[PDB]
Amino acid sequence: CGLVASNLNLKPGECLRVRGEVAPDAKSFVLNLGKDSNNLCLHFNPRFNAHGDANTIVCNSKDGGAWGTEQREAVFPFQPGSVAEVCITFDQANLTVKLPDGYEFKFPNRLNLEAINYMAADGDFKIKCVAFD
Amino acid sequence: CGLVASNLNLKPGECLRVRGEVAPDAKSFVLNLGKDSNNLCLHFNPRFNAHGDANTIVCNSKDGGAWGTEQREAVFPFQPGSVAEVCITFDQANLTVKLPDGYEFKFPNRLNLEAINYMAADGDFKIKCVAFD
């Protein structure tokens, strides 16, 4: 269990930037964003070698404790033993996740949050900097 | 009412850098550091005009919910409506607080903490970036 931040008050259009070091023997890491641990508009889970998955970004939501429908992306711009920056912004329709190597994707915003107030990091990613636009 | 962060895992000699925006009508702002909200090794409270103090930094500790004895600093390199960075490190004896314009002071590590896991901001200071060296 890594850094947990609350009262972020991240509003639509504002950018959250997270830079961290991926462990040389990294298996996976998680950034969770939402209201609290039971209410996540984005569970962002790069899997290097975890849950039978290799070099796959798994995303999901959590609403009132219930995991939503998982989605997977088709690009994996992470390397064990390197520094990586993730940048996230949202509006009512979508979260936009911007990753290294120019890659960006959208994940549907399935919750009804006015702001993103909670972020939790876990796994093989040492957070070095967080910036709130 | 500002950012709260836990599981910081800050160890002796490591640098925590906090950059924020001092509100234009600023009267007081607070950075709290410690084990948790009831065990603060550093309550850092620049007071522009608040609680009977003008342009004075008030520092204190909190041990098991009980405030310690206030210490007032000799310097005040803050201005309302500006950006400011504070940098904090600690060891067995002291917290060292580095301030804008080359000022710094020490505050005793009264709780003998060997890790700082909690930070919270309150008052007229909007955190924009937190970095770990």
Ligand SMILES: CCCO[C@@H]1O[C@H](CO)[C@@H](O[C@@H]2O[C@H](CO)[C@H](O)[C@H](OCc3c[nH]nn3)[C@H]2O)[C@H](O)[C@H]1NC(C)=O
């Ligand atoms: C045919 C059945 C396949 O079904 C599997 O079921 C697992 C358990 O439900 C899912 O794994 C789960 O996926 C979740 C988000 O969807 C979170 O990442 C959970 O960890 C959250 C966590 C724990 N610790 N830190 N973070 C993780 O255990 C796994 O992806 C899924 N696989 C597929 C291909 O669909």
Ligand SMILES: CCCO[C@@H]1O[C@H](CO)[C@@H](O[C@@H]2O[C@H](CO)[C@H](O)[C@H](OCc3c[nH]nn3)[C@H]2O)[C@H](O)[C@H]1NC(C)=O
């Ligand atoms: C006018 C003087 C009569 O004596 C005063 O008594 C106040 C209440 O005891 C002290 O003020 C208190 O000081 C504490 C740290 O010691 C914290 O800063 C408290 O804020 C907590 C807080 C709110 N939001 N964020 N943090 C703050 O209300 C104040 O220094 C003291 N002043 C002097 C000059 O002696």
